Amino acid sequence: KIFLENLYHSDCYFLPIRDNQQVLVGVELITHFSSEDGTVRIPTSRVIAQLTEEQHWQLFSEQLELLKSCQHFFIQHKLFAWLNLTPQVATLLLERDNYAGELLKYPFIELLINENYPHLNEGKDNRGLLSLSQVYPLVLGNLGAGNSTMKAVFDGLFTRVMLDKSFIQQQITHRSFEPFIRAIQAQISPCCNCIIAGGIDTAEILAQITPFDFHALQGCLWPAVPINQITTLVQR
Numbered sequence: 001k002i003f004l005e006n007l008y009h010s011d012c013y014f015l016p017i018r019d020n021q022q023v024l025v026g027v028e029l030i031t032h033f034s035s036e037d038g039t040v041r042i043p044t045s046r047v048i049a050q051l052t053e054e055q056h057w058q059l060f061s062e063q064l065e066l067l068k069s070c071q072h073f074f075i076q077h078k079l080f081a082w083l084n085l086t087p088q089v090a091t092l093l094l095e096r097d098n099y100a101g102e103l104l105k106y107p108f109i110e111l112l113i114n115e116n117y118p119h120l121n122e123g124k125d126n127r128g129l130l131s132l133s134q135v136y137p138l139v140l141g142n143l144g145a146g147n148s149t150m151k152a153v154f155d156g157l158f159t160r161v162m163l164d165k166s167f168i169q170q171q172i173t174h175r176s177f178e179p180f181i182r183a184i185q186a187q188i189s190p191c192c193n194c195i196i197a198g199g200i201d202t203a204e205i206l207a208q209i210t211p212f213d214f215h216a217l218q219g220c221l222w223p224a225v226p227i228n229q230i231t232t233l234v235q236r
Helices: 044-050 053-069 071-076 087-095 100-104 120-125 127-133 165-173 175-188 203-212 227-233
Strands: 008-018 024-035 080-084 109-113 138-143 160-163 194-197
Touching (some): 008 053, 008 227, 024 053, 053 071, 053 080, 053 087, 053 100, 087 100, 165 175, 165 203
């Protein structure tokens, strides 16, 4: 019941993911970590770098427990939740005879990775990712970040893919490149139905992105909310 809270305090937020009509369809679970005594906020990358494999599992478990605690809300409003997947947790899910089960029972919870995931360029040849994708919803959170190829996408590993804010904003800022978004979207859609656009941070960006008809959108227009205020995101 303590998980990682004896080492770092997790102050958790939900990033709203809304469809092209702004209806809430899911949330991404994020954490602002503080030191144990609360004196300083610690960058997530620095927290994650330190963790042993068991600590990686504890942090994952703490987040799972948080999401499980919201299960009635997620099911009732038909939403999904993104939970960060690290390779350390991947190994434990795949190689223990009793870790994979709890996650499985909550299918609204989806495993989120980024283009920096180890050996992502192997696509379906990444044994761990292939295996997890066989039973869990897998999401690539930052397609277009320029840190991997799309092999894993065309290999069919993902349930959803989100185009990174840097990619979306680059093509919208340099307006003549907007067709590049359309071409990328068209090519990916058969291999992954659900394409999401990040970086929707201004009214102008939303106006430009709406005609693309992405399944969902994420960005500063819909600020993070503390996890206990998730009810503020849906109809009263």
